[PDB]
Design a protein around this nucleic acid. Structure first.
Lengths: 73, 62
DNA sequence: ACTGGAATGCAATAAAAT
DNA sequence: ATTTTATTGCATTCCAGT
């Protein structure tokens, strides 16, 4: 196992599927002062499901590393 | 895997001269160099990383 | 002013050429 | 055995969109 433990990974694979099925949406995250984003809402759900924290740049990096892997099939 | 391609005398005479002139690259430089060198921008990006790493390695044993 | 995402950096590492 | 290209797993920095 590494940084993204498989237990966290699956929380990320839920977070993905139950925030977007395929990305989507035009910035309907702020109505009051609550300014959210995809990654941050992922990191949040990781906290709510694992207790383990992990910041928005980790969620940034991870997605990019995955994309790379996918592309180099 | 893979195969590793060894860049020619021209390719490296180009690179070494530009590294000597400056240690890291900027897009402007990758582009210009890439044209003259006949290599990928990607490759250039790496060659600099590695060339640096070679320099770092030589600041080690006493 | 906030953000997600691309580009870039770096350490570890692999393997062909020398 | 050392040197020269190339990749991978993170982080960190740079570029826009809203």
């Amino acid at each position: 196992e590494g940084v993204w433990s498989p237990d966290i990974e699956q929380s990320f694979q839920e977070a993905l599927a139950i925030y977007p099925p395929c990305g989507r949406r035009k910035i309907i995250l702020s109505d009051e002062g609550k300014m959210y984003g995809r990654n941050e809402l992922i990191a949040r759900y990781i906290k709510l499901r694992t207790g383990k924290t992990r910041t928005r740049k980790q969620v940034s990096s991870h997605i990019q590393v995955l994309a790379r892997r996918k592309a180099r099939e | 895997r893979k195969k590793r391609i060894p860049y020619s005398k021209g390719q490296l005479r180009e690179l070494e001269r530009e590294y000597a002139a400056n240690k890291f690259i900027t897009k402007d430089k990758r582009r210009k160099i890439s044209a003259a060198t006949s290599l990928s921008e990607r490759q250039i990006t790496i060659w600099f990383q590695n060339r640096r790493v070679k320099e770092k390695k030589v600041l080690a044993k006493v």
